[PDB]
Amino acid sequence: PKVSVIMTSYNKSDYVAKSISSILSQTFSDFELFIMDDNSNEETLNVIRPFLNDNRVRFYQSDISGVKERTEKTRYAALINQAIEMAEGEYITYATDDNIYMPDRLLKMVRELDTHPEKAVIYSASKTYHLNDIVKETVRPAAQVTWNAPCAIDHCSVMHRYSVLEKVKEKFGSYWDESPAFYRIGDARFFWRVNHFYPFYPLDEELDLNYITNEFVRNLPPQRNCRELRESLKKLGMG
Numbered sequence: 135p136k137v138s139v140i141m142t143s144y145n146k147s148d149y150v151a152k153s154i155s156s157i158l159s160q161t162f163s164d165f166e167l168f169i170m171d172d173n174s175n176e177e178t179l180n181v182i183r184p185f186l187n188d189n190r191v192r193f194y195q196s197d198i199s200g201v202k203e204r205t206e207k208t209r210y211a212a213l214i215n216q217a218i219e220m221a222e223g224e225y226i227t228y229a230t231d232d233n234i235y236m237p238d239r240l241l242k243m244v245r246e247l248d249t250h251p252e253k254a255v256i257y258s259a260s261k262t263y264h265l266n267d268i269v270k271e272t273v274r275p276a277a278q279v280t281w282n283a284p285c286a287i288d289h290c291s292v293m294h295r296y297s298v299l300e301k302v303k304e305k306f307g308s309y310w311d312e313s314p315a316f317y318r319i320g321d322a323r324f325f326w327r328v329n330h331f332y333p334f335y336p337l338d339e340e341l342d343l344n345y346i347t348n349e350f351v352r353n354l355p356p357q358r359n360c361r362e363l364r365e366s367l368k369k370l371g372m373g
């Protein structure tokens with residue numbers, strides 16, 4: 135397939151079907167969908183079950199269990215890295231179990247990369263709907279080419295060439311960073327690595343949406359943050 139879509143899943147039984155269905159109904163159909171479930175509860179697994187009948191879906195479930203294992207690494211990064219190693223697509227893209235793809239997301243993003251060989255990473259605008267019906271509507275625009283993506287661009291808003299992964303792994307030893315010090319902002323850290331080599335090209339359309347209204351947290355290491363990443367890129371001076 136042209137595109138590999140990598141989705142991570144963990145215990146969002148009330149949202150995951152909408153997410154998966156939004157991917158499977160894309161107008162561009164030439165993709166494989168990795169559903170990397172991190173050993174979710176019964177309810178979640180049962181909502182995911184019927185989707186496994188679509189031949190484009192590649193389902194993998196970890197054996198992760200307990201607070202030690204859940205905090206040993208940034209789980210979704212470990213899962214993404216695993217998917218990346220099995221991927222066949224020329225273009226890579228990400229999804230989560232509570233994010234919805236708009237129907238023409240893949241078509242448009244594929245077309246942008248097919249049409250501009252000079253662009254290696256692209257990003258779209260993203261929208262969030264607040265519920266309480268709708269009360270608030272937020273949009274994260276994509277108006278400029280950026281060498282400083284961390285914390286300005288989300289997980290589910292990007293698509294890139296497989297070749298980018300090559301570069302990143304050559305310099306850093308892995309694709310995404312599994313260190314649990316980057317648990318809250320794993321996508322930002324991956325973007326930080328990419329931004330050592332590639333800028334992010336905008337596609338000014340809203341192509342993904344989010345709907346919104348402890349022993350785990352207490353067992354992570356101290357969490358590094360955005361400023362730290364952004365400041366480090368600002369240095370460097372790639373743009």
Ligand SMILES: Cc1cn([C@H]2C[C@H](O)[C@@H](COP(=O)(O)OP(=O)(O)O)O2)c(=O)[nH]c1=O
Binds near residue numbers: 141209
């Ligand atoms: C906590 C956890 C999350 N995940 C996945 C679920 C999500 O797809 C992804 C991001 O988690 P999520 O909790 O949705 O992050 P955010 O706070 O930004 O909404 O990580 C795992 O795969 N394993 C885990 O142990």
Ligand SMILES: [Mg+2]
Binds near residue numbers: 232
């Ligand atoms: Mg979320």
Ligand SMILES: [Mg+2]
Binds near residue numbers: 318
């Ligand atoms: Mg986030």
